[PDB]
Write an enzyme that holds these catalytic residues in place. Structure first.
Site, PDB file in Angstrom:
ATOM      1  N   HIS A 107     -16.166 -20.230  60.040  1.00 24.60           N
ATOM      2  CA  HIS A 107     -15.712 -21.134  58.680  1.00 24.60           C
ATOM      3  C   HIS A 107     -14.644 -22.150  59.204  1.00 24.60           C
ATOM      4  O   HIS A 107     -13.776 -22.451  58.150  1.00 24.60           O
ATOM      5  CB  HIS A 107     -15.472 -20.237  57.608  1.00 24.60           C
ATOM      6  CG  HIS A 107     -16.210 -18.935  57.323  1.00 24.60           C
ATOM      7  ND1 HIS A 107     -15.876 -17.801  57.314  1.00 24.60           N
ATOM      8  CD2 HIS A 107     -17.516 -19.199  57.037  1.00 24.60           C
ATOM      9  CE1 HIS A 107     -17.088 -16.912  57.015  1.00 24.60           C
ATOM     10  NE2 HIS A 107     -18.050 -17.828  56.816  1.00 24.60           N
ATOM     11  N   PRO A 119      -4.767 -20.530  47.454  1.00 26.06           N
ATOM     12  CA  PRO A 119      -3.200 -20.347  47.437  1.00 26.06           C
ATOM     13  C   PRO A 119      -2.556 -20.917  46.019  1.00 26.06           C
ATOM     14  O   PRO A 119      -2.991 -22.163  45.824  1.00 26.06           O
ATOM     15  CB  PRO A 119      -2.624 -21.138  48.655  1.00 26.06           C
ATOM     16  CG  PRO A 119      -3.900 -21.112  49.535  1.00 26.06           C
ATOM     17  CD  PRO A 119      -5.006 -21.084  48.706  1.00 26.06           C
ATOM     18  N   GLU A 120      -1.555 -20.201  45.573  1.00 28.85           N
ATOM     19  CA  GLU A 120      -0.947 -20.860  44.321  1.00 28.85           C
ATOM     20  C   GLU A 120       0.220 -21.626  44.953  1.00 28.85           C
ATOM     21  O   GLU A 120       0.576 -21.656  46.061  1.00 28.85           O
ATOM     22  CB  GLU A 120      -0.300 -19.738  43.322  1.00 28.85           C
ATOM     23  CG  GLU A 120      -1.664 -18.781  42.784  1.00 28.85           C
ATOM     24  CD  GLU A 120      -2.355 -19.597  41.882  1.00 28.85           C
ATOM     25  OE1 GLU A 120      -1.755 -20.807  41.321  1.00 28.85           O
ATOM     26  OE2 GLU A 120      -3.439 -19.161  41.540  1.00 28.85           O
ATOM     27  N   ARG A 124     -15.403 -20.754  51.521  1.00 31.20           N
ATOM     28  CA  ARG A 124     -15.791 -21.672  50.165  1.00 31.20           C
ATOM     29  C   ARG A 124     -16.188 -22.984  50.461  1.00 31.20           C
ATOM     30  O   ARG A 124     -17.306 -23.686  49.857  1.00 31.20           O
ATOM     31  CB  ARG A 124     -14.777 -21.528  49.069  1.00 31.20           C
ATOM     32  CG  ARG A 124     -14.723 -20.307  48.529  1.00 31.20           C
ATOM     33  CD  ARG A 124     -15.610 -19.690  47.514  1.00 31.20           C
ATOM     34  NE  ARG A 124     -16.992 -19.439  48.166  1.00 31.20           N
ATOM     35  CZ  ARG A 124     -17.199 -18.288  48.829  1.00 31.20           C
ATOM     36  NH1 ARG A 124     -16.452 -17.079  48.699  1.00 31.20           N
ATOM     37  NH2 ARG A 124     -18.387 -18.066  49.316  1.00 31.20           N
TER      38      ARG A 124
END
Ligand code: ZN
Length: 252
Positions: free
Chosen positions: A92, A1-2, A111
């Site tokens: 995850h 996320p930005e 990730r």
DNA sequence: AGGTAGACAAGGA
DNA sequence: CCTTGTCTACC
């Protein structure tokens, strides 16, 4: 996320966890925990604390508990959700905070790049990873003057300067390219080469770019496509070790 | 020391 | 092989 997405997560997540008391912390990928080093210490210290607040610093979430602050970076694909302890976990899920009311704050991350640090509240801001973080881009602490001071005394490109977290908090690759496009400045230009007019312009567009996003891209990921302003094909190169997007006509 | 480049995280294509 | 921020490591 930005930064703008992190701010939305902050706003949305807070009401869902505020006032809840931690009964357990379960960790399925210990590497995410960066402080305390031992993930068992991390788990043990949070038990019995109540969530009091949730703030944001750049792209970091800062969960405020009773004694401690939990500093969380989602990086690329990290996500938080609140759900019932009775339901099967989704794939995850690497860290789960269990509350006394039978709900859970679940951290997911395909990730496994995200990080967590816990310190006493009063120490968080002077330890990693928050220590040295630059001013919020939407705060008066981020000013043309502050930008100029850094620009003047560096040999780096303007893009590299803007990507420096010590210069300004949370400006990632996307918003650097977009802001540079709106300010008419080539990303590969030496920061020290910017005129005062250009610093002021860049500052103004940086704040507008971030500000609009928190509350349609021109260049990022649009290489080969017509510039939305002049129709010239957008180009992509490597500046400051990364994919960089720009209009060769409008940026100088 | 001080400025600053890139090593590192790790799984999906 | 590739993805991305950033904080540790380097000269
Ligand atoms: Zn153009």
């Amino acid at each position: 996320p930005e930064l703008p997405e992190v701010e939305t997560i902050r706003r949305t997540l807070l009401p869902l966890i505020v006032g809840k008391t931690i009964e357990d912390v379960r960790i399925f990928w210990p590497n995410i925990i960066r402080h305390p080093r031992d993930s068992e210490a991390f788990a043990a210290r949070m038990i019995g604390q109540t969530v009091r607040g949730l703030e944001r610093r750049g792209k970091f979430l800062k969960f405020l508990l009773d004694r401690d602050a939990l500093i969380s970076h989602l990086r690329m694909e990290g996500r938080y959700a609140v759900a019932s302890a009775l339901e099967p976990l989704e794939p995850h899920t690497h860290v789960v905070f269990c509350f006394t009311d039978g709900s859970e704050l679940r951290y997911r991350d395909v990730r496994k790049f995200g990080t967590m640090h816990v310190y006493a509240k009063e120490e968080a801001d002077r330890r990693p990873p928050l220590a040295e973080l630059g001013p919020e881009p939407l705060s008066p602490a981020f000013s043309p003057a502050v930008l100029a001071e850094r620009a003047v005394k560096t040999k780096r490109s303007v893009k590299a300067l803007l990507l420096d977290c010590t210069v300004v908090a949370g400006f990632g690759n996307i918003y650097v390219d977009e802001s540079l496009f709106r300010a008419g400045i080539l990303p590969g230009r030496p920061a020290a080469s910017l005129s005062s007019k250009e610093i002021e312009r860049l500052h103004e567009e940086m704040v507008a770019t971030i500000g609009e996003a928190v509350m349609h891209l021109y260049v990022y990921g649009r290489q080969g496509n017509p510039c939305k302003r002049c129709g010239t094909p957008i180009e992509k190169t490597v500046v400051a070790g990364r994919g960089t997007h720009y209009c060769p006509r409008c940026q100088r």
